[PDB]
Design a protein around this ligand. Structure first.
Ligand SMILES: COC[C@H](C)Nc1ccc(NS(=O)(=O)N(C)C)c(Nc2ccc3nn[nH]c3c2)n1
Length: 110
Protein backbone atom coordinates (compact mmCIF):
# COMPACT_ATOMS: atom_id res chain seq x y z
CA UNK A 1 0.00 0.00 0.00
CA UNK A 2 1.39 3.58 -0.58
CA UNK A 3 1.99 5.88 2.45
CA UNK A 4 -1.40 7.32 3.47
CA UNK A 5 -2.17 10.94 2.51
CA UNK A 6 -0.54 13.61 4.78
CA UNK A 7 -2.64 15.03 7.67
CA UNK A 8 0.16 17.19 9.15
CA UNK A 9 2.11 19.91 7.27
CA UNK A 10 3.60 22.74 9.45
CA UNK A 11 4.62 24.97 6.49
CA UNK A 12 1.16 24.64 4.84
CA UNK A 13 -1.16 27.67 5.38
CA UNK A 14 -4.05 26.51 7.72
CA UNK A 15 -7.21 27.94 9.47
CA UNK A 16 -12.91 28.91 10.02
CA UNK A 17 -17.24 26.87 8.04
CA UNK A 18 -14.58 24.16 8.88
CA UNK A 19 -18.92 23.02 10.33
CA UNK A 20 -17.59 20.32 7.88
CA UNK A 21 -16.31 18.47 11.03
CA UNK A 22 -19.20 19.17 13.44
CA UNK A 23 -22.30 18.49 11.20
CA UNK A 24 -20.85 17.09 7.88
CA UNK A 25 -18.80 14.40 9.80
CA UNK A 26 -21.35 10.44 8.06
CA UNK A 27 -18.90 8.82 10.51
CA UNK A 28 -23.57 5.79 9.94
CA UNK A 29 -23.92 2.00 9.12
CA UNK A 30 -22.06 2.26 5.64
CA UNK A 31 -19.10 4.41 6.95
CA UNK A 32 -16.80 1.48 7.89
CA UNK A 33 -15.25 0.98 4.35
CA UNK A 34 -14.24 4.70 4.24
CA UNK A 35 -12.95 5.25 7.81
CA UNK A 36 -9.37 4.32 6.63
CA UNK A 37 -7.22 4.12 3.48
CA UNK A 38 -8.27 1.29 1.11
CA UNK A 39 -6.09 -1.68 2.07
CA UNK A 40 -5.47 -3.06 -1.50
CA UNK A 41 -3.16 -5.79 -0.04
CA UNK A 42 -5.82 -7.13 2.44
CA UNK A 43 -8.61 -6.86 -0.27
CA UNK A 44 -6.21 -8.53 -2.82
CA UNK A 45 -6.72 -5.58 -5.26
CA UNK A 46 -3.18 -5.24 -6.72
CA UNK A 47 -4.63 -2.85 -9.38
CA UNK A 48 -6.40 -0.42 -6.94
CA UNK A 49 -3.42 2.00 -6.54
CA UNK A 50 -2.59 1.53 -10.26
CA UNK A 51 -6.12 2.84 -11.15
CA UNK A 52 -6.52 5.26 -8.18
CA UNK A 53 -3.75 7.91 -8.06
CA UNK A 54 -5.54 10.27 -5.60
CA UNK A 55 -6.71 7.96 -2.78
CA UNK A 56 -8.75 9.57 0.02
CA UNK A 57 -10.85 8.42 2.95
CA UNK A 58 -12.77 9.96 5.86
CA UNK A 59 -10.12 8.72 8.36
CA UNK A 60 -7.59 11.03 6.56
CA UNK A 61 -10.32 13.79 6.30
CA UNK A 62 -11.12 13.43 10.07
CA UNK A 63 -7.40 13.68 11.14
CA UNK A 64 -7.08 16.69 8.74
CA UNK A 65 -10.04 18.66 10.27
CA UNK A 66 -8.75 17.89 13.82
CA UNK A 67 -5.11 18.74 12.84
CA UNK A 68 -6.31 22.10 11.36
CA UNK A 69 -4.82 20.93 8.01
CA UNK A 70 -7.16 22.87 5.67
CA UNK A 71 -7.31 26.58 4.65
CA UNK A 72 -10.92 26.50 3.26
CA UNK A 73 -14.05 24.21 3.09
CA UNK A 74 -13.50 24.02 -0.75
CA UNK A 75 -10.29 21.95 0.15
CA UNK A 76 -12.04 19.49 2.51
CA UNK A 77 -15.11 19.25 0.19
CA UNK A 78 -12.79 18.37 -2.76
CA UNK A 79 -11.29 15.50 -0.58
CA UNK A 80 -14.86 14.14 0.13
CA UNK A 81 -15.50 14.49 -3.67
CA UNK A 82 -12.22 12.54 -4.40
CA UNK A 83 -13.28 9.78 -1.88
CA UNK A 84 -16.75 9.25 -3.57
CA UNK A 85 -15.31 9.62 -7.18
CA UNK A 86 -12.44 7.15 -6.51
CA UNK A 87 -15.02 4.59 -5.43
CA UNK A 88 -17.22 5.04 -8.62
CA UNK A 89 -14.14 4.89 -10.99
CA UNK A 90 -12.59 1.71 -9.47
CA UNK A 91 -15.98 -0.10 -9.33
CA UNK A 92 -19.13 -0.66 -11.55
CA UNK A 93 -22.59 1.01 -11.08
CA UNK A 94 -24.70 -0.92 -8.49
CA UNK A 95 -21.79 -2.65 -6.62
CA UNK A 96 -22.30 -2.98 -2.80
CA UNK A 97 -19.41 -0.54 -2.24
CA UNK A 98 -20.87 1.91 -4.86
CA UNK A 99 -24.26 1.82 -2.94
CA UNK A 100 -22.49 2.53 0.40
CA UNK A 101 -20.70 5.64 -1.10
CA UNK A 102 -23.93 7.04 -2.72
CA UNK A 103 -25.75 6.73 0.66
CA UNK A 104 -22.96 8.74 2.43
CA UNK A 105 -22.72 11.15 -0.57
CA UNK A 106 -26.52 11.90 -0.25
CA UNK A 107 -26.16 12.45 3.56
CA UNK A 108 -23.12 14.62 2.47
CA UNK A 109 -25.27 16.70 0.02
CA UNK A 110 -27.32 17.59 3.23
C1 LIG B 1 -19.19 -3.71 0.43
O1 LIG B 1 -18.14 -4.53 0.89
C2 LIG B 1 -17.25 -4.69 -0.20
C3 LIG B 1 -15.88 -4.06 0.03
C4 LIG B 1 -15.17 -4.14 -1.32
N1 LIG B 1 -15.10 -4.71 1.14
C5 LIG B 1 -14.29 -3.97 1.89
C6 LIG B 1 -13.63 -4.49 2.99
C7 LIG B 1 -12.80 -3.65 3.68
C8 LIG B 1 -12.65 -2.32 3.25
N2 LIG B 1 -11.91 -1.43 3.88
S1 LIG B 1 -10.23 -1.43 3.91
O2 LIG B 1 -9.72 -1.34 2.46
O3 LIG B 1 -9.92 -0.23 4.78
N3 LIG B 1 -9.72 -2.78 4.87
C9 LIG B 1 -9.50 -3.96 4.03
C10 LIG B 1 -8.71 -2.45 5.92
C11 LIG B 1 -13.35 -1.83 2.14
N4 LIG B 1 -13.18 -0.54 1.81
C12 LIG B 1 -13.23 -0.07 0.55
C13 LIG B 1 -13.30 1.32 0.42
C14 LIG B 1 -13.39 1.90 -0.85
C15 LIG B 1 -13.36 1.14 -1.95
N5 LIG B 1 -13.40 1.47 -3.25
N6 LIG B 1 -13.35 0.35 -4.00
N7 LIG B 1 -13.25 -0.66 -3.11
C16 LIG B 1 -13.25 -0.18 -1.84
C17 LIG B 1 -13.20 -0.80 -0.64
N8 LIG B 1 -14.15 -2.67 1.51
Amino acid sequence: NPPPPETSNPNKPKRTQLYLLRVVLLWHQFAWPFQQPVDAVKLNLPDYYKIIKTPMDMGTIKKRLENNYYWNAQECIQDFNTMFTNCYIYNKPGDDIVLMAEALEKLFLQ
